């Protein structure tokens, strides 16, 4: 499972608009636990693609 820092870097490196990136990062801080972080990463992939 990717760490919180890796997931943040992925958001930052994506081509999404800045406000979209900022809101995703805000949501990330509310995620708690390895399981939810993994689910976060999965949904994030669908948005990035």
């Amino acid at each position: 499972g990717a760490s919180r820092s890796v997931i943040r870097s992925i958001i930052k490196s994506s081509r999404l608009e800045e406000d979209r990136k900022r809101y995703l990062m805000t949501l990330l801080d509310d995620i708690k636990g390895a399981n939810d972080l993994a689910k976060f990463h999965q949904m994030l992939m669908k948005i990035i693609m």
């Binding site: 809101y23 995703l24 949501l27 990330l28 509310d30 708690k32 939810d36 976060f40 949904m43």
Partner: peptide, 19 residues
């Protein structure tokens, strides 16, 4: 409360992904 907040964040994320 921490888990519920996390669950809600995932729901908000899901809505952005249009899932």
């Amino acid at each position: 409360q921490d888990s519920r907040r996390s669950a809600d964040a995932l729901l908000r994320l899901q809505a952005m992904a249009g899932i």
